[PDB]
């Protein structure tokens, strides 16, 4: 029979087989279920898709056709859930959000 | 030559799926690689802890789903759970 990738069987773009191998060899459990790598790949694919779509939108609003680390930082820090997920994460060459305290601006 | 075995090609496939005409730089590629590795480690480790707590020796989709509920905030958890359930259901039908 012709070999069908488990990713294609699950309708995914992430490698189900590689995820299964990493789970088995990663010192997590004595055994790994059949659907665990599928679930893991689906979650990872969803997360990367969401971040990539937000970063691509940020790049497009900046009139750029290539995602750079700054666009990833803008995508993450402008989303409260993504910022909470990656609160303790530093992104290289990502800069900081443009934020100036109100009291520092001139009054008149 | 050591076959570093990254996630670059799959992330590029996802990017072309969501933004057909948008490329990505090498630095952003490495950052997204690190993000995928970090999230995989977090979810796998927490699922392993869940399995250990209940005196189970296997990691199933239930452990992964509970891990996803525990570490992802807000609607991120809900949508990741939906995606994982859909993928597992489709895979079971082969």
């Amino acid at each position, epitope marked *: 029979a012709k070999a069908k990738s488990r990713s294609s069987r699950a309708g995914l773009q992430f490698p189900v087989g590689r995820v299964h191998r990493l789970l088995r060899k990663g010192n997590y459990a004595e055994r790994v279920g059949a659907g665990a790598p599928v679930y893991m790949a689906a979650v990872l694919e969803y997360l990367t898709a*969401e971040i990539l779509e937000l970063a691509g939108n940020a790049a497009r609003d900046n009139k750029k056709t290539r995602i750079i680390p700054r666009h990833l930082q803008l995508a993450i820090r*402008n*989303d*409260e859930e993504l910022n909470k997920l990656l609160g303790k994460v530093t992104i290289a060459q990502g800069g900081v959000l443009p934020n100036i305290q109100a009291v520092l601006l001139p009054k008149k | 030559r050591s076959r570093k075995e990254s996630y670059s090609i799959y992330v590029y496939k996802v990017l072309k799926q969501v933004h057909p005409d948008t490329g990505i730089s090498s630095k952003a590629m490495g950052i997204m690689n690190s993000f995928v590795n970090d999230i995989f480690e977090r979810i796998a480790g927490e699922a392993s802890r869940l399995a250990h707590y209940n005196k189970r020796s296997t990691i199933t989709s239930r452990e992964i789903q509970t891990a996803v509920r525990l570490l992802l905030p807000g*609607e991120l958890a809900k*949508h990741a759970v939906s995606e994982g359930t859909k993928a597992v259901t489709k895979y079971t039908s082969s």
Partner: single-chain antibody, 226 residues
Framework: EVQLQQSGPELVEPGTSVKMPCKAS????????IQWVKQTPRQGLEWIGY????????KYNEKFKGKATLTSDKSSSTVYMELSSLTSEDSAVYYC?????????????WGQGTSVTVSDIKMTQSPSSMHASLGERVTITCKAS??????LSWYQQKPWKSPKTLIY???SLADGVPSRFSGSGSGQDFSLTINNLESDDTATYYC?????????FGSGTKLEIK
């Protein structure tokens, strides 16, 4: 649990300004954008804009730019909308709806509506109005102009009532919606199907897209039972 309170009807003379609140409770206030939608008998539902209380970020419809101004108050979990220079064609119902920052998410919970009376992607719904008996099958087509990657949602609006979400992401059932409602389609063709009908199902159904920056609604479909 989640509830978005709104003020009552306000009578305003033309040329003045008005403001209505959207006091929200039952959830983490800063995690969800508040989207404002106006509904008129001659245009149907129309998207105005949203505000993100997390970072005060806003985004307005081009045809409502300048006319509407959105503000957020983190202390009281309230969002206000200001209309300046109220022109005669502003006597309509203005809705404030909750929507998460996730792209897959839609306008899930709505305010009751403040009936204010004064003194792009074209989203096409094939069946304008239809009739059905107590247990037949109905199907509503919502062919779109451009391509949207399954960022389509279906809403049910009882007369003189706020719309209720049925389908989001073009296939996913919303919370509390029975499995009788079933969405399908992707790209430019979308469909909403109701298998078993009830007297409750007598309402107007709209399909909303949020794949591109100006969100657009369908013309609606008045569905009548028996």
């Amino acid at each position: 649990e989640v509830q978005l309170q709104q003020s009552g009807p306000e009578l305003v003379e033309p040329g003045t300004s008005v403001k209505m609140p959207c006091k929200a409770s039952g959830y983490t206030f800063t995690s969800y954008t508040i989207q404002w939608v106006k509904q008129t008998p001659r245009q149907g539902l129309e998207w105005i804009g949203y505000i993100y209380p997390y970072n005060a970020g806003t985004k307005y419809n081009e045809k409502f730019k300048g006319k509407a101004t959105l503000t957020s108050d983190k202390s009281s979990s309230t969002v206000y909308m200001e209309l300046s220079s109220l022109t005669s064609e502003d006597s309509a119902v203005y809705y404030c709806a909750r929507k998460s920052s996730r792209l897959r998410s839609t306008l899930d919970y709505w305010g009751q509506g403040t009936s204010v009376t004064v003194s792009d992607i074209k989203m096409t719904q094939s069946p304008s109005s239809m009739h059905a008996s107590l247990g037949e099958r109905v199907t509503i087509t919502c062919k779109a102009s451009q391509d949207i990657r399954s960022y389509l949602s279906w809403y049910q609006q009882k007369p003189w009532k706020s719309p209720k979400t049925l389908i989001y992401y073009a296939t996913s059932l919303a919370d509390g919606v029975p499995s009788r409602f079933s969405g399908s389609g992707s790209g430019q063709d979308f469909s909403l199907t109701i298998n078993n009908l009830e007297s409750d199902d007598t309402a107007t159904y709209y399909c909303l897209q949020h794949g591109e920056s100006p969100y657009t609604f369908g013309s609606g479909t008045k569905l009548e039972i028996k």
